[PDB]
Amino acid sequence: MNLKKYLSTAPVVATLWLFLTAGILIELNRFFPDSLFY
Amino acid sequence: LNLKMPSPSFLGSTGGWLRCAETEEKYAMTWSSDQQHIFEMPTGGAAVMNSGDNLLYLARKEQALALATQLRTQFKIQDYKIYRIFPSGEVQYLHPKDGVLPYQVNKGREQVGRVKSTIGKNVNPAQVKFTSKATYDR
Amino acid sequence: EKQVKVVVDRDVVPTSFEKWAKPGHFSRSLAKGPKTTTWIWNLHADAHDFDSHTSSLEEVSRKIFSAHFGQLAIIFIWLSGMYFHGARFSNYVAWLSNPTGIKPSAQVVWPIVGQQILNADVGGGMQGIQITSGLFQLWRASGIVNELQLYVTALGGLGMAGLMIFAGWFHYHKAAPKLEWFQNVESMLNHHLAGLLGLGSLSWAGHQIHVSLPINKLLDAGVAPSSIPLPHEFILNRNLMAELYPSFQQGLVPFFTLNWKQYSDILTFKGGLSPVTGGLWLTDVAHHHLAIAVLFLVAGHMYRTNWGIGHSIKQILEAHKGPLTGEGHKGLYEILTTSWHANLAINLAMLGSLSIIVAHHMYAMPPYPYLATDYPTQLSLFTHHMWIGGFCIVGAGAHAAIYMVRDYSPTVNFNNVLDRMIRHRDAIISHLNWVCIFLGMHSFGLYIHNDTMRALGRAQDMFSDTAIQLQPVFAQWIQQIHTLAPGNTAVNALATASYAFGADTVTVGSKIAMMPIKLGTADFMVHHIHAFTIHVTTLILLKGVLYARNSRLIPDKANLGFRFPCDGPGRGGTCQVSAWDHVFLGLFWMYNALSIVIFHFSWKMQSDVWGTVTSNGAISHITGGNFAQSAITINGWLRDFLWAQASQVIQSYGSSLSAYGLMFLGAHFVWAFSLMFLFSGRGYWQELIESIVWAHNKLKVAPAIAPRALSITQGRAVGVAHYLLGGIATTWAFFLARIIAVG
Amino acid sequence: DYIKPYNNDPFVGHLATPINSSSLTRAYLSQLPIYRRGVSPFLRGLEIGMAHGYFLIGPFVQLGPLRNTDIKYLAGLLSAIGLIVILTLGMLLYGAVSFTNDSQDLESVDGWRQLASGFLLGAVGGAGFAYLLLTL
Amino acid sequence: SASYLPSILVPTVGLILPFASMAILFIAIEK
Amino acid sequence: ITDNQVFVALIMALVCGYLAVKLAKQL
Amino acid sequence: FEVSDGEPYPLNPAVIFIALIGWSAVAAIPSNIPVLGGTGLTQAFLASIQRLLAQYPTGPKLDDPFWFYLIVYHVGLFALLIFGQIGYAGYAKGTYN
Amino acid sequence: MFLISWRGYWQELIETLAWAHERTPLANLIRWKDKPVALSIVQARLVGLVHFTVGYILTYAAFVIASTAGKFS
Amino acid sequence: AHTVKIYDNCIGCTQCVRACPLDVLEMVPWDGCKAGQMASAPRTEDCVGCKRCETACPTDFLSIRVYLGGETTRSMGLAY
Numbered sequence A: 001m002n003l004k005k006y007l008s009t010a011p012v013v014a015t016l017w018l019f020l021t022a023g024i025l026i027e028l029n030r031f032f033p034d035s036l037f038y
Numbered sequence B: 001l002n003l004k005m006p007s008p009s010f011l012g013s014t015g016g017w018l019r020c021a022e023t024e025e026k027y028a029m030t031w032s033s034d035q036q037h038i039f040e041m042p043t044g045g046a047a048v049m050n051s052g053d054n055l056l057y058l059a060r061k062e063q064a065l066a067l068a069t070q071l072r073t074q075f076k077i078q079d080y081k082i083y084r085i086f087p088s089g090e091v092q093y094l095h096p097k098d099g100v101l102p103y104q105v106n107k108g109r110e111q112v113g114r115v116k117s118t119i120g121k122n123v124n125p126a127q128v129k130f131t132s133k134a135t136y137d138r
Numbered sequence C: 001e002k003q004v005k006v007v008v009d010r011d012v013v014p015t016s017f018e019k020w021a022k023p024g025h026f027s028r029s030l031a032k033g034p035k036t037t038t039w040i041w042n043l044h045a046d047a048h049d050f051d052s053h054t055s056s057l058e059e060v061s062r063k064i065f066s067a068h069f070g071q072l073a074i075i076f077i078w079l080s081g082m083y084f085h086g087a088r089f090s091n092y093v094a095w096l097s098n099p100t101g102i103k104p105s106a107q108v109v110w111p112i113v114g115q116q117i118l119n120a121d122v123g124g125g126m127q128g129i130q131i132t133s134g135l136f137q138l139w140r141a142s143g144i145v146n147e148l149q150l151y152v153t154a155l156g157g158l159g160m161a162g163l164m165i166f167a168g169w170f171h172y173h174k175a176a177p178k179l180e181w182f183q184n185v186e187s188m189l190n191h192h193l194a195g196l197l198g199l200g201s202l203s204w205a206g207h208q209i210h211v212s213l214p215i216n217k218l219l220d221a222g223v224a225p226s227s228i229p230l231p232h233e234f235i236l237n238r239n240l241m242a243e244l245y246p247s248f249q250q251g252l253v254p255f256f257t258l259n260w261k262q263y264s265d266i267l268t269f270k271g272g273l274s275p276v277t278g279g280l281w282l283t284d285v286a287h288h289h290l291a292i293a294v295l296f297l298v299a300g301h302m303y304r305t306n307w308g309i310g311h312s313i314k315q316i317l318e319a320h321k322g323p324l325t326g327e328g329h330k331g332l333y334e335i336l337t338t339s340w341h342a343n344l345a346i347n348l349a350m351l352g353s354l355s356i357i358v359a360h361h362m363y364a365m366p367p368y369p370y371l372a373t374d375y376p377t378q379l380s381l382f383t384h385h386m387w388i389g390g391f392c393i394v395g396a397g398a399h400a401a402i403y404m405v406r407d408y409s410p411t412v413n414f415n416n417v418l419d420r421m422i423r424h425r426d427a428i429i430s431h432l433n434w435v436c437i438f439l440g441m442h443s444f445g446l447y448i449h450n451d452t453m454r455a456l457g458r459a460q461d462m463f464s465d466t467a468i469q470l471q472p473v474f475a476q477w478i479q480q481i482h483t484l485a486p487g488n489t490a491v492n493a494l495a496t497a498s499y500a501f502g503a504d505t506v507t508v509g510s511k512i513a514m515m516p517i518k519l520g521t522a523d524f525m526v527h528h529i530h531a532f533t534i535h536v537t538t539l540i541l542l543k544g545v546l547y548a549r550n551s552r553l554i555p556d557k558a559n560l561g562f563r564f565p566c567d568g569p570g571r572g573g574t575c576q577v578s579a580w581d582h583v584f585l586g587l588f589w590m591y592n593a594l595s596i597v598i599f600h601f602s603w604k605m606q607s608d609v610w611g612t613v614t615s616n617g618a619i620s621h622i623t624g625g626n627f628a629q630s631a632i633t634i635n636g637w638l639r640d641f642l643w644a645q646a647s648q649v650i651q652s653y654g655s656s657l658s659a660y661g662l663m664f665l666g667a668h669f670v671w672a673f674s675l676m677f678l679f680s681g682r683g684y685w686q687e688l689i690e691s692i693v694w695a696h697n698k699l700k701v702a703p704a705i706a707p708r709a710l711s712i713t714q715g716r717a718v719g720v721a722h723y724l725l726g727g728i729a730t731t732w733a734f735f736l737a738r739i740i741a742v743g
Numbered sequence D: 001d002y003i004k005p006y007n008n009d010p011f012v013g014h015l016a017t018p019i020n021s022s023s024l025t026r027a028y029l030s031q032l033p034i035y036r037r038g039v040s041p042f043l044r045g046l047e048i049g050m051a052h053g054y055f056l057i058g059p060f061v062q063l064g065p066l067r068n069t070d071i072k073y074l075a076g077l078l079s080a081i082g083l084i085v086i087l088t089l090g091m092l093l094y095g096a097v098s099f100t101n102d103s104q105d106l107e108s109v110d111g112w113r114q115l116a117s118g119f120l121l122g123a124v125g126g127a128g129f130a131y132l133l134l135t136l
Numbered sequence E: 001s002a003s004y005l006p007s008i009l010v011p012t013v014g015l016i017l018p019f020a021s022m023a024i025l026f027i028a029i030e031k
Numbered sequence F: 001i002t003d004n005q006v007f008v009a010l011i012m013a014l015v016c017g018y019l020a021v022k023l024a025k026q027l
Numbered sequence G: 001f002e003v004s005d006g007e008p009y010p011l012n013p014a015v016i017f018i019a020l021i022g023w024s025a026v027a028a029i030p031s032n033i034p035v036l037g038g039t040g041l042t043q044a045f046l047a048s049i050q051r052l053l054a055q056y057p058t059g060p061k062l063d064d065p066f067w068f069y070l071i072v073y074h075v076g077l078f079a080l081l082i083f084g085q086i087g088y089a090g091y092a093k094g095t096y097n
Numbered sequence H: 001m002f003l004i005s006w007r008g009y010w011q012e013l014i015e016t017l018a019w020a021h022e023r024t025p026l027a028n029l030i031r032w033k034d035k036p037v038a039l040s041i042v043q044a045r046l047v048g049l050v051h052f053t054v055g056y057i058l059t060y061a062a063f064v065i066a067s068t069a070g071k072f073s
Numbered sequence I: 001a002h003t004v005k006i007y008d009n010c011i012g013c014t015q016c017v018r019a020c021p022l023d024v025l026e027m028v029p030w031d032g033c034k035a036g037q038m039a040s041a042p043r044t045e046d047c048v049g050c051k052r053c054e055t056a057c058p059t060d061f062l063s064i065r066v067y068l069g070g071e072t073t074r075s076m077g078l079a080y
């Protein structure tokens, strides 16, 4: 019953990391919309 | 050889040898068995090999060899002989050609198609241009 | 006599996460480590292939029963999602108040990157994406009037999904049935015929009689949805049902006294569409479900199970034998009880055919209320079921080839129909190929000839109504017979089954619901094109299944397997020789055939059926009679259909339909990206990957998992997947945008 | 049981099915201008041509581009004659490459030449007869 | 002008020349 | 371009064809 | 007659006669329906045949009832003929089920 | 067509056609001098590339000429 | 008429002969490896070029190379 190892596999870790990245991007886009030319 | 040898009980099929086999090469396979086994013909179908002697005709050497492979694998039959018949009628012994399986090393066989060293030593195509020589030729 | 008993193994498989951390554990080769990037693809390619994992039929049967439960749970979750979306983010009540004016919508897009524009002004207060799934019409037909019922249904669906999750885990780790179970085809058929379908239709008929009928009757009588009594009130207070249907005054006594004719208020056979909503009369639908339930229940007592009475499928199969078929259907029973691939092939072909039939019957005889008036929903549903049916048919062929390559046995298939067919497979495929050539010439050549004539100004020499005419006399005759059936062959039927055959037109909300679909020369040519494409795709699939084991080119294709790249550059070339490749080609042909079929339905419906009706009966279609003279030429199919109707999907930018336009472009990209994988080989990509790997090596950043190119078979699969995805998405966006912008 | 190998010898690429081989089928396939015993190549060609041109004229006269004009029959006859000439050309080419010098038995250059001449003459005559029937 | 030259050449180069060339070419390749 | 001029051009074209047939047969 | 190769095939004209008589008698049962006009499909079909024979050059068009009678009569007659030959050869002649 | 389907499906198809031609009466007399065979692997790539190239060029030629003509004529 | 050539790096594993479907290869005595056997191609007239032997060769670089040359009836695998 090694759930940590499974959660550490490539698909799970990749989906979690990309989900966090997309969430950060979206959150930044609603708090700071239509960002251009810094 | 032994053209009167009994044939497996097959019901025809439309995948057998065509007219081309009549005017050209036609392979034959003759094997002996002790049980009336059911085997898949290489032409598509199912046949029952007569207990005793079985002889059938095919239009390709690969078909006969494939049938022999399944007779040797699906069943423990190793006494399969593949001959070739020409339109003239002269038979030719093709498989095994020596009574021993090809993958079983046997004395009396002369090496054919041997190249010294590895392929990395092959000459460039530019060095054998305009000549009847190949890269693999030393 | 065999006892139809249940035997199971307890705690057969332990429940633990130990195997979750070892990808590829199900395969001996995949459990040794990747060593290359091809292992990642092989892990998913052979994940659901339970027959390759183990050689035991019991284990495969258990792995199927479970995972069937998982898919059932997935379907229940999806259904719960649809119901919850309807209850929380949809204008269902507003739509009920004004079904013709309010556009169905159950999706609300978040305002983040300007995507808030997708929230179309569908009406009813809320603004969102218009749904063309027919969820609103289905819910109305089911008697739903308030969103509380939708919420309860969503919760029930979630609970059912949880149950289907527990059942799937329990039937694999707590109680796994043995192979004797799953081989009781007589019992499984009896139960599915009398319990899954018979009792299911019976229960649905009861619900319609007690919920759908009264609620819909009140809705069609001008009563507000909030003022209609609750469904339980119609059951508790019989006075209400009696008032709405006097037949209920007699109660169930007439049923038990065989005085079924007293149920003429609830069990009618009117035959036509309701003039108020445009759909089938709910009474005829309830009576239909009752009859189908009784018929299925009677059919469910045919096979023999644990009792002397019944029938044996094996005995019936072996009994059918004739002079032209030596052993008839002998050995087929053992084939369908020892190989899941054969059963899957038959079931997939039938399920796909059933889906296609469903599409035709649903558009011709709109079953749900206000379904015909909602052209977007009609187009989407016909096209959707048509596509799912075609995909299931191609899958049926693929699984037939799989069974032929792996589960076939010469002893079982001896002198039977299957063996006798494999014997003359050359006659079958050459004659079928000849039929395909004849059909293509006499179908596409007619179109090409018309193009050549119109371009030369020789319109008098065309295959049209004005010029040489090719009238579907047989189909037109069947239509006339259907038109006259309600009085000479259907004595108790009060109207034709479908108004598409004839009779009169039906208009609901100043919109045409269903009018006679007259067939002409254009329909003759298009129908022949459909037959031609169906023949070529079935030829490809049949060829792949018949030669799956061997052929005159490769005498031992079976030993090579069902899914192998090729035998090499020998014998002139043996590329795409395996049956899997035949399925790969059949996918493109099925896509072509289905695309042409949906194109014909869309254009014909928009030019001769769908449209508006002005006061006094004047009819004006979306594309006034242009299909009669424009569908007879390829130029017309490109100008009046692909170019004229695409203006809605290309000009959708700046509005709520912009998304569709975007998807219209994206799909194209995908369809064009597939070409990359279809016109190329892995040798070149492997060399390019070698150079890229050298670049990585120069920086000490090379990966341990040796990068490799996609396999030949994997490359073909990726190419076909992208091709189908892009094409279907392009036609999906085009159809949806065109039908939503206008009509 | 009706389906058997063509020559009762299995392993052949053919089957003796009902319409493939039968009393009626064997009688019909036989006696035709081709395959009939005691018929010279020229006679076979003449019969085949007179039977081919007759039905070949029909399509051109009925659906030809000039099917509505007063010379529909003449135009169709000319088109059929041209098609017959092209077919005869094909026949002669086939005989020129496929067959060699040997006895005239329909499988030689002279035999196929006689067959082609007969086919051309018969086809032209049949087309003319059909045209005459249509005009009358 | 020679308005008859095109009417005599187009059919010759479109029907006579192709058939004759194909026949000679077929004889050459086969023999 | 008179008819005679067209005929002269055709004759020259025939000569060119003959030369191009000889050149090809020689090759 | 030989159906295939040297294997004989039993042909009995009585099969055709019995199939024709049986189907005509079955279809001769009257039915008070507008298409049949209160008579069996056999009588209606024969009546339509006579009507269309009067006008020998002009054939029946798409709206003529003759086509419905023709299809149903041929469907049933062909079914009796096919099933009849199956029963005669399979059971009477010993060809087996 | 040639850019997607590769040799092997066509080889078997041609074998089936060969069987049909040499097993049909009144047409057995006509015998192919050269044994029918499917287009080679490389031959298929060249034929498909030629078809694709001819279509690309002809399609854009017709489009450009017709558009520039109708627009300004 | 494909040319099958065996090189000196052959280890005499016989996998090429076992995987050949046309009996084109065989094993002959040799002294270049402990196996004492080497692959030979004395029936190259029956070769079709399927390259099953090339795929079945374990050496780093294939010790058996099949070159597609003259095409005949046997090499085209024509049963008609």
Ligand code: CLA
Residues within 6 Å of the ligand: C202, C203, C205, C206, C207, C209, C234, C235, C236, C237, C238, C241, C247, C248, C249, C250, C251, C252, C253, C255, C263, C266, C267, C290
């Ligand atoms: C699986 C499908 C299904 C299901 C679950 C149900 C379920 C139900 N139906 Mg129903 N129904 C169905 C299909 C279904 N039906 C179909 C296909 C039909 C034919 C179209 C009907 C027609 C029907 C009618 C007409 C009625 C129901 C009724 C009912 C409800 C009570 C049944 C009852 O026991 O009353 C039993 C009623 C009797 C009359 C018993 C018969 C024998 C009695 C004992 C006679 C002896 C005399 C005695 C003094 C009673 C006098 C009764 C007289 C005044 C009528 C019940 C919830 C009843 C209802 O509750 O209405 C809302 C109702 O009246 N159903």
Ligand code: CLA
Residues within 6 Å of the ligand: G014, G015, G016, G018, G019, G022, G075, G076, G077, G079, G080, G081, G083, G084, G085, G086, G087, G088, G091, G092
């Ligand atoms: C269509 C008419 C018809 C039908 C249904 C049958 C049916 C039957 N015949 Mg029979 N027969 C017929 C005509 C028919 N026969 C005629 C005209 C003759 C005179 C030559 C005979 C002479 C004959 C003999 C000598 C024998 C039989 C026997 C039998 C039985 C053996 C099994 C069998 O034949 O297959 C059919 C079996 C079934 C159970 C029927 C299934 C039907 C399917 C499910 C649907 C059919 C739909 C059909 C195509 C509809 C057509 C349209 C309609 C308007 C007519 C069987 C029940 C044998 C017997 O007596 O039994 C031992 C036998 O000895 N028949």
Ligand code: CLA
Residues within 6 Å of the ligand: A019, A020, A021, A022, A023, A024, A027
């Ligand atoms: C994965 C990256 C990510 C990141 C970095 C953030 C960051 C942030 N989010 Mg956010 N969020 C995310 C994903 C993320 N979110 C997702 C996937 C959803 C669901 C679509 C939400 C929904 C959400 C809402 C409704 C709100 C925020 C808010 C906020 C800000 C509040 C301050 C804070 O520090 O809380 C840190 C928050 C997180 C790190 C994410 C936790 C999200 C949890 C699951 C709460 C959402 C509950 C949801 C309504 C119901 C169940 C969801 C299910 C997944 C369990 C913030 C900086 C609040 C805001 O607007 O600030 C004014 C607010 O109202 N988020």
Ligand code: CLA
Residues within 6 Å of the ligand: C064, C065, C068, C069, C072, C182, C184, C185, C187, C188, C191, C192, C194, C195, C196
């Ligand atoms: C009248 C009894 C009955 C009923 C109603 C069903 C119904 C069903 N069976 Mg089933 N089956 C039965 C008896 C029955 N079976 C028997 C006796 C056998 C042994 C001979 C089998 C062996 C069998 C196999 C091997 C498989 C099925 C499968 C299925 C499902 C098909 C998928 C589908 O169409 O979605 C429709 C789904 C629904 C309409 C939802 C309804 C679900 C509820 C729970 C009704 C099912 C009741 C269940 C059979 C018994 C309850 C047991 C109890 C201890 C809780 C379906 C739910 C397939 C499947 O999907 O696997 C899970 C499949 O693989 N059955």
Ligand code: CLA
Residues within 6 Å of the ligand: C044, C045, C046, C047, C048, C049, C050, C348, C391, C392, C393, C394, C395, C396, C398, C402, C562, C563, C580, C583, C721, C725
């Ligand atoms: C009830 C339907 C059904 C079922 C139960 C099965 C079951 C099975 N199939 Mg089959 N099949 C079906 C329908 C079905 N199929 C249909 C409809 C087709 C035609 C498309 C096929 C064509 C087919 C082929 C050609 C093959 C199988 C194979 C298999 C077996 C292994 C599957 C596997 O492990 O691959 C793993 C599955 C995947 C890696 C997923 C692939 C994803 C594709 C591209 C679909 C993407 C859909 C999605 C909507 C895309 C958009 C979203 C995107 C942007 C992310 C398995 C027993 C294989 C086999 O038998 O093994 C030798 C085999 O080769 N199937």
Ligand code: CLA
Residues within 6 Å of the ligand: C669, C670, C671, C672, C673, C674, C675, C676, C677, C678, C679, C680, C684, C688
């Ligand atoms: C739409 C058609 C299409 C497209 C888009 C491409 C694109 C590409 N080809 Mg190409 N090709 C095509 C058709 C196409 N080809 C055809 C018909 C042929 C003839 C067989 C070729 C033959 C060919 C060869 C021989 C070569 C290429 C190469 C390349 C790459 C060049 C480098 C580059 O620009 O990378 C940039 C990347 C892109 C343009 C792709 C866009 C980025 C994507 C969309 C982002 C990732 C996915 C995204 C997250 C969304 C998906 C999410 C998921 C959940 C579904 C590139 C990816 C060359 C190469 O490999 O380059 C090194 C190479 O040598 N192609």
Ligand code: CLA
Residues within 6 Å of the ligand: C441, C442, C443, C444, C445, C446, C448, C449, C452, C461, C462, D056, D059, D060, D063, D064, D065, D066
């Ligand atoms: C494959 C589809 C197709 C069809 C059905 C037609 C049909 C027709 N075309 Mg057309 N055409 C086509 C494609 C087609 N074309 C294409 C693709 C082009 C562009 C290249 C053209 C360009 C074209 C032109 C320029 C013209 C036509 C014309 C015509 C008409 C007369 C042609 C003629 O005389 O042929 C002759 C036919 C035959 C000699 C024989 C036909 C074969 C026979 C009937 C088959 C019998 C088989 C038999 C049943 C077997 C069993 C018998 C045995 C057992 C005894 C005719 C209706 C002409 C016209 O004016 O239009 C009205 C005309 O000028 N076409």
Ligand code: CLA
Residues within 6 Å of the ligand: D064, D065, D066, D075, D076, D078, D079, D081, D082, D083, D085, E010, E011, E013, E014, E015
């Ligand atoms: C490349 C040059 C070329 C030329 C010059 C022609 C010329 C002609 N074509 Mg053709 N065509 C061509 C290429 C060509 N085609 C190609 C490549 C195709 C395939 C795409 C076609 C497909 C095609 C079709 C389908 C049809 C034509 C038809 C015609 C004729 C139509 C004229 C008309 O409208 O009145 C009609 C004039 C007549 C009916 C009189 C018939 C004149 C005959 C054919 C010429 C004399 C032959 C002669 C008897 C034989 C040699 C002499 C003999 C004594 C030894 C015309 C003579 C139509 C036709 O009428 O077919 C016959 C028609 O049906 N063509």
Ligand SMILES: CCCCCCCCCCCCCCCC(=O)OC[C@H](COP(=O)(O)OC[C@@H](O)CO)OC(=O)CCCCCCCCCCCCCCC
Residues within 6 Å of the ligand: C320, C321, C322, C323, C324, C325, C328, C329
């Ligand atoms: C001729 C009257 C039927 C009208 C044609 C359409 C019928 C639809 C059924 C399709 C199969 C054709 C019927 C003959 C077939 C038929 O029923 O024969 C009879 C025979 C069945 O009788 P048996 O004695 O074998 O019965 C024992 C078993 O059937 C046990 O159930 O079937 C065959 O063995 C041959 C199968 C196909 C033979 C090749 C024909 C292929 C052509 C396919 C195209 C058909 C015509 C297309 C429409 C124009």
Ligand SMILES: CC1=C(/C=C/C(C)=C\C=C\C(C)=C\C=C\C=C(C)\C=C/C=C(C)/C=C/C2=C(C)CCCC2(C)C)C(C)(C)CCC1
Residues within 6 Å of the ligand: D050, D051, D052, D054, D055, D121, D122, D123, D124, D125, D126, D128, D129
């Ligand atoms: C598929 C079909 C069919 C068909 C049939 C037929 C087709 C028949 C016939 C026929 C035919 C198709 C015929 C033809 C003919 C022709 C003729 C009868 C002629 C003649 C004569 C003459 C007058 C001649 C002359 C001449 C001259 C002028 C000189 C030169 C030489 C000659 C001799 C040529 C049937 C019904 C079975 C079945 C169903 C459908």
Ligand code: SF4
Residues within 6 Å of the ligand: C565, C566, C567, C568, C569, C570, C573, C574, C575, C576, C681, C712, H006, H041
């Ligand atoms: S490498 Fe590709 S093209 Fe070559 S034989 Fe294999 S599958 Fe065919």
Ligand code: SF4
Residues within 6 Å of the ligand: C570, I004, I019, I020, I021, I022, I023, I024, I025, I046, I047, I048, I049, I050, I051, I052, I053, I054, I066
């Ligand atoms: S290419 Fe194929 S046939 Fe030729 S030697 Fe190798 S394995 Fe044998």
Ligand code: SF4
Residues within 6 Å of the ligand: I006, I009, I010, I011, I012, I013, I014, I015, I016, I017, I038, I039, I056, I057, I058, I059, I063, I064
């Ligand atoms: S050629 Fe390759 S497979 Fe054959 S014996 Fe030598 S090393 Fe082994």
